[PDB]
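Run: sequence + chloride ion -> complex structure.
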Amino acid sequence: MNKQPQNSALVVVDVQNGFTPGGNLAVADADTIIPTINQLAGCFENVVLTQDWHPDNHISFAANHPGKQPFETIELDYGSQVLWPKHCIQGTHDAEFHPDLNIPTAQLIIRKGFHAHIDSYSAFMEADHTTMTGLTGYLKERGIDTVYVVGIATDFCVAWTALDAVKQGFKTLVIEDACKGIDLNGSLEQAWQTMQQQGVVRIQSTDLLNEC
Ligand SMILES: O=C(O)c1cnccn1
Ligand SMILES: [Cl-]
Ligand SMILES: [Cl-]
Ligand SMILES: [Cl-]
Ligand SMILES: [Zn+2]
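>> structure
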């Protein structure tokens, strides 16, 4: 294939059982993006997978906060936190990659959200805005300056990963038809707006696949 250059990477965000139909935080139709992701990954020299990877006592779970229910919000030290159903607990079926995901060439699996008291939608920086995950250092050591983001959810882990990539100096693109969103209280269109404002490029898979 006519692959993307060595300075670009595909970051495949949270294509896990937990976020796909049948999972504990199932995003409708999120499994339908997987064939596109599998095909895209073949076109990149460098591919990183992310995995939401929570301990059972994670702060982002509604179940760990008395009197709160999923999809409500809570004020934590670091700001507003959406509370979720328990999802993607370390070592469980829910946290596994979706069985249709097929990227044997993937070079890194970075887990996130493993600190009990801090969420991390972004693969680059945790929800405290200060705890760096290691991904920036990894990518820059490998000479990567351009990041393409796909996966689930468009408006949370994808958007926050993309916005953090921009903050860290990467040319950042999101491949829209290889993402699926959840849209809580208008989050989906707001994520696209904030991403566009910050210079994230919104592209379609055919844009990349037609030069592969
Ligand atoms: O992958 C995501 O977008 C995500 C992760 N944890 C909770 C909710 N959403
Ligand atoms: Cl739950
Ligand atoms: Cl299990
Ligand atoms: Cl840090
Ligand atoms: Zn999570």
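>> summary
The longest helix spans residues 154-167. The chain has one domain: 1-212.
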